[PDB]
């Protein structure tokens with residue numbers, strides 16, 4: 002399970 | 012060697028190695044700017060404590076922080092980068108600056124937005140990691156609010172302060188009513204955030220700490236009498252004078268609608284149903300949480316189970332603090 006390397010703050 | 016940038020109503024005299032200082036820290040414990048560390052080519056965070064010493068309180072609140080930052084170390088906790096002072100000696104010594112990593116923003120908004128279990132359950136997983144670590148270091152936060160939980164674009168999560176140590180909707184009953192609080196105290200806070208993350212809005216609002224306790228019982232469920240007694244004399248009355256609020260189920264509280272790989276959303280409910288327990292004594296634990304099937308996925312001993320960190324007159328402080336900013 003590849004850990005999420007993206008997060009959308011905008 | 013140093014240079015002074017006037018930020019707001021106070022001059023920030025930092026190392027020339029830090030440019031572009033910009034205030035983002037309008038907190039009371041200090042003013043924090045966003046600089047640039049030309050000697051690493053990376054964004055840092057500089058926080059100035061103006062004369063931490065000036066009264067038994069501050070000098071101590073400051074001495075606390077300094078110490079903690081030096082020995083506390085985890086990827087999910089605001090890491091220190093550099094503490095220094097422009098003052099040349101203990102004599103003129105009277106200003107402390109802490110450089111530490113710069114995160115993109117707290118959870119205040121990201122929570123509203125819609126994030127998959129992956130990003131969510133994970134961000135959570137990371138919080139238990141710092142919290143746990145913090146805990147394993149005789150430190151219990153208490154004041155855990157998204158207002159002080161910073162995140163980064165790469166979906167990295169960390170913790171800002173140690174808060175209280177020894178915006179109110181994220182505190183637990185043990186603090187609200189004022190009572191014994193254990194380590195699992197910070198589990199209530201996380202609980203909210205997670206819910207407040209799914210609900211898409213403050214789980215337990217309230218205009219006051221009273222209307223606060225009211226909406227929590229109402230929503231969750233009246234403390235089974237055994238617990239009621241644990242309450243102080245006056246607060247026990249209050250509760251006992253209120254209608255029968257058996258709350259609601261976690262199914263109706265957090266409907267499937269709020270969620271998006273099919274069981275996961277109820278798997279995540281099972282966790283809430285163990286994190287949002289008013290009776291502190293039946294509330295889930297960091298360990299158990301990391302083991303929960305909803306968080307366990309991301310588990311990692313190097314991170315989760317980390318090795319524990321480490322172990323007066325006005326003038327005595329100044330010397331102490333200084334001694335501290337001087338060990339570098």
Ligand SMILES: O=C1c2ccccc2-c2n[nH]c3cccc1c23
Nearest residue numbers: 043056112113114115116117161
């Ligand atoms: O208040 C913030 C803060 C607020 C929003 C985004 C990042 C930070 C941040 N990044 N590093 C530090 C060190 C101390 C305080 C703060 C930071």
